[PDB]
Design a protein around this ligand. Structure first.
Ligand SMILES: C[C@H](CS)C(=O)N1CCC[C@@H]1C(=O)O
Ligand code: NA
Ligand SMILES: [Zn+2]
Ligand SMILES: [Zn+2]
Ligand SMILES: [Zn+2]
Length: 231
């Protein structure tokens, strides 16, 4: 049922409804001569929508807005990018031109600027120390500490028990570490354990790339990260 990388041409976006007013968005992109999928989140907030992450580039993000209008038909008024990489902020300018208020932590904004990636406009305060949580409308934002990147956020939807782990969490099909150029390998498992301790009620866990699962994706990611650590 969940849209897979094989099913989505680059440039197109699928939505997957998880619960009343919660969807993931799934897009694909060429990377390393392969095609990889990438997930974001959409959460209804009243008669508006909160978007979590771009769809990995401007073209895809335009497709994302069009698919949202087609399938849901409510305005995206805010967006949060969960780290500074292009699968999270690539498309921010598209969102901004469409009237979306884009947000990220100051950590993410600083790193995006250094990197030459798009920079969300608004700053999310209160997330700079490991273990910090803040409410943002229908979600809670949580900074678990450095993992896939120094700035990685996770997002929890309490009404639906959905934990969006972003790229700090790997899908089960990934058995070897991926892009760790910006990672903190030493802290990554500790950061995962903070997610487990903060959201032990989570029922649906979404990795940055690939198929959702349950909280077992946390242990899985720790297993893979520790194996890479011991390479
Ligand atoms: C551009 C993204 C940023 S997490 C990236 O590095 N990717 C996406 C899928 C493959 C590769 C990876 O994270 O291993
Ligand atoms: Na919390
Ligand atoms: Zn990343
Ligand atoms: Zn604004
Ligand atoms: Zn990613």
């Amino acid at each position: 049922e969940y849209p897979t990388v094989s099913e989505i041409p680059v440039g197109e976006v699928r939505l997957y409804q998880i619960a009343d007013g919660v969807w993931s968005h799934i897009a694909t992109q060429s990377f390393d001569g392969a095609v990889y999928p990438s997930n974001g989140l959409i959460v209804r907030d009243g008669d508006e929508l909160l978007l979590i992450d771009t769809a990995w580039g401007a073209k895809n993000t335009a497709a994302l807005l069009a698919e949202i209008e087609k399938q849901i038909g409510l305005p995206v008024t805010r967006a949060v990018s969960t780290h500074f990489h292009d699968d999270r902020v690539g498309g921010v300018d598209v969102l901004r031109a469409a009237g979306v208020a884009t947000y990220a932590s100051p950590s993410t904004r600083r790193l995006a600027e250094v990197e030459g990636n798009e920079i969300p406009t608004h700053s999310l305060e209160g997330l700079s120390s490991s273990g910090d949580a803040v409410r943002f409308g229908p979600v809670e934002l949580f900074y678990p500490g450095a993992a896939h990147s120094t700035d990685n956020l996770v997002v929890y939807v309490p009404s639906a028990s959905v934990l969006y782990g972003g790229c700090a969490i790997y899908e089960l099909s990934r058995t070897s570490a991926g892009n760790v150029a910006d990672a903190d390998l030493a802290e990554w498992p500790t950061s995962i354990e903070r997610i487990q301790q903060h959201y032990p009620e989570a029922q649906f866990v979404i990795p940055g790339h690939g198929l959702p699962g349950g909280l077992d994706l946390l242990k899985h990611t720790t297993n893979v990260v520790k194996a890479h650590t011991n390479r």
